[PDB]
Amino acid sequence: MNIFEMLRIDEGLRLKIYKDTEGYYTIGIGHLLTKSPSLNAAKSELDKAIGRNTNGVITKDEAEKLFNQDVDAAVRGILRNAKLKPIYDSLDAVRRAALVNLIFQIGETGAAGFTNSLRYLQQKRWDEAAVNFAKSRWYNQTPNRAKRIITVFRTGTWDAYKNL
Ligand SMILES: [Cl-]
Ligand SMILES: [Cl-]
Ligand SMILES: [K+]
Question: Quick one: which of 63, 89, 118, 146 could link to 28 by a disulfide (CB 3.0–4.6 Å)?
Fold first, then answer.
């Protein structure tokens, strides 16, 4: 288990544009294209991203390329965010992966509302952090995925992703 295998499980792989859990145009391994309701707008974003006129369809290799860029950028942004970097640095590698996964899904701005939960993680109050993370729109909207991420933050093990 590692961050890529973890996010590959949570996001799946689709080589044609599709709508994510929020209704937004996405492709590949959870690569958000745009929040716009315009398919054409999403297709333009895809072409920009891949570097060619794709028509809404990409290769597995291309999907993987954007995926690598997304995870890298996610970690990197965590490191530049003063509200997140200290949390990240305080955790072990397993929990760190859980935090990258959360940000990949909700974005830094999304995480702005997780100050309390993040603080419990920094305090290493695992159970409390877990309880706190569940009290969120994120949890309510994607509970199965959230449960997984929360168990990871709670135990520091990949048990929730085994058998997946
Ligand atoms: Cl991109
Ligand atoms: Cl879910
Ligand atoms: K997805």
Answer: 63
